[PDB]
């Protein structure tokens, strides 16, 4: 990943719960996170490397207790993954720039438009209103 892995940085600006979902994919609570009812126009960026990666227009109400979006704003800014851990098998998203942990990529979202479902950390995420 291109962006400049700096942990000590990340430690002092980063909030105890932006740290451990974005470096150690940690997931907030369903139902806790700042963004998750959020409807307000604008762009939602990286926490850690600030690129953009959700537009509100893109948002849409899943009931799943996290920010949740049936597209990013391109096909480049998202890295997917599998993942295994928690006795599952999941596809996580992370950031493509930096590397951080997002969330989970599911195939139940809107049926009349892709389909996914990006149910994203309101941690992992920072809001521009616009
Ligand atoms: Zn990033």
Known sequence: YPYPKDDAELRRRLTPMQYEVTQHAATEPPFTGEYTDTEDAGIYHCVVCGTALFE???KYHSGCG???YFKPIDGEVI????DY???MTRVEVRCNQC???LGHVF???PRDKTGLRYCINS???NFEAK
């Open 85 to 87: 851990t928690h006795g």
């Open 99 to 101: 590397g951080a942990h």
């Open 66 to 68: 996290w920010p949740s």
């Open 123 to 125: 941690a992992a995420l």
């Open 107 to 109: 195939e139940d979202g």
């Open 56 to 58: 509100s227009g893109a």
């Open 79 to 82: 890295d997917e993954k599998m």
